Ligand binder design. Structure first.
Ligand code: NA
Ligand code: NA
Ligand code: ZN
Ligand code: ZN
Lengths: 285, 285
């Protein structure tokens, strides 16, 4: 059974070569035998195979314009209808872009000349999905195709990505957002984009050398992009009794939206509160 | 006259050494003779000098915990009051973090041992300011100091920075946000953080190889973080008559907030609209 997994695969480093698609499938690199995109709307896309599937595709080594799946005649191999984001591979690729999930590019024999191998399939490491759009198909302008921009991840801490087995844990984010359904714990909204709901996982006690916060569900809030910014730059704090308070003027906003399977560790809350200029004293709210 | 300028300075590459602070000042690297931070709340901070100014400072080469300016007795050289964000250097450093402006680190003789030079002052290239907080001073815990986390920029397109002379133009962003006063052109709000107002500059026709958008004031909108996300992932478009429309359901939101010195080039609007799955036809709104 294939297990969908983001990041490098144990045993198969960047550079690894394979003879055909069944190899790649057995190794755990892709899910599929023919299909270009390994992915699902719910979970994200963990790999793509690039073997000149459309003539819209462009390959610049470190940059890739990848064209999506859908709307081909099985017999003709010619576009007969528009591409959409119901396609799990197309949807999964957008969901990778939004969650910042890295995508294993596996490059194939038949593709663009300088970067493709002469024969077989090489695994060329992880790329980040940056944007997506629709354009007109080159061979048949009356039909729309979906397209993605992919950029090579050179340093994993630099580009902000999340991976399954470590860098920051993908699982942690996915739990917290899943429990809340991408609703901001402060203002209640869900940001709706083309593919679906959108939110940001925001650590309460920051990660790294100085602060040493754990990367876990208890040290994280699901927030909208606006509230993330406020929260990280002294405009919100949370009380011991889980009220959200405007740090700039002292005014109490309202209660934090809680979920029973999501246990916020109050030590981390206290720590975050303690990064403000004047620590809120007893009786402040 | 010193001109405050973000990024590398012509003639002084990373590695450049100098004998004392007056040299650094003449070269154009810093603004000041003693003061650690070159910077202002309005414009941002373009440099810091790191010469063991506080014992709270930590130096890890690629990471730096820098401690801010303020609250010292001129005679004693000991902390006598709390640090605040009225200090132009402290404020400027937060404003650098928010605008994503790179900061020239110049490292000094008296600092942390492995990374400091043996004598003089070396220019160690650009760093990005990532976060800031307040903590207790080591020598006098009853007083608060301001602190910053700085990370070395290795690739300038990767870390998302904006520089004065080119990468993306800092001037372009600064104009657009200045004309609008960090108000979202879609929803009207200003995000207020500790140091002041906050917004995002959002190109209308994206930059780079595929789309080839210009990096100019006419191809950019000032937006709140929430609306930026919607705008880049098929949830908003703008009409020829400058109304904002919800791309998901077709519903018209309201008119775009315009400013007379900010001329949006309608070709770019049309281009952005044309990235949606079905291009809006005549009579759509
Ligand atoms: Na954060
Ligand atoms: Na953008
Ligand atoms: Zn919110
Ligand atoms: Zn807005």
């Amino acid at each position: 059974a294939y297990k969908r997994t983001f990041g490098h695969i144990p045993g198969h480093p960047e550079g690894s070569t394979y003879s055909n698609r069944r190899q790649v499938q057995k190794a755990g690199l892709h899910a599929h035998l023919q299909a270009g995109i390994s992915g699902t709307a719910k979970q994200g896309a963990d790999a793509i195979v690039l073997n000149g599937g459309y003539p819209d595709d462009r390959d610049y080594g470190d940059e890739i314009i990848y064209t999506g799946h859908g709307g081909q005649d099985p017999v003709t191999k010619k576009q007969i209808r528009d591409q959409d984001l119901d396609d799990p591979g197309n949807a999964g690729l957008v969901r990778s872009q939004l969650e910042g999930l890295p995508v294993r590019v596996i490059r194939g024999a038949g593709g663009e000349k300088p970067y493709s191998p002469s024969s077989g399939y090489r695994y060329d490491g992880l790329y980040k999905v940056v944007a997506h759009w629709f354009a007109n198909h080159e061979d048949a302008p009356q039909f729309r195709v979906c397209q993605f921009q992919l950029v090579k991840i050179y340093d994993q801490v630099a580009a902000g990505v999340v991976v399954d087995n470590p860098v920051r844990s993908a699982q942690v984010v996915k739990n917290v957002k899943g429990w809340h359904k991408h609703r901001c714990q402060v203002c209640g909204i869900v940001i709706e984009v083309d593919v679906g709901p959108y939110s940001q996982g925001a650590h309460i006690r920051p990660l790294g050398r100085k602060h040493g916060g754990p990367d876990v569900e208890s040290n994280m809030l699901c927030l909208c992009p606006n509230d993330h910014v406020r929260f990280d730059n002294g405009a919100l704090y949370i009380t011991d009794d889980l009220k959200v308070v405007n740090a700039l003027n002292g005014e109490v906003i309202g209660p934090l939206r809680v979920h029973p399977r999501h246990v916020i560790d109050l030590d981390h809350i206290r720590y975050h509160r303690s990064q403000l200029p004047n620590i809120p004293l007893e009786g402040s709210s």
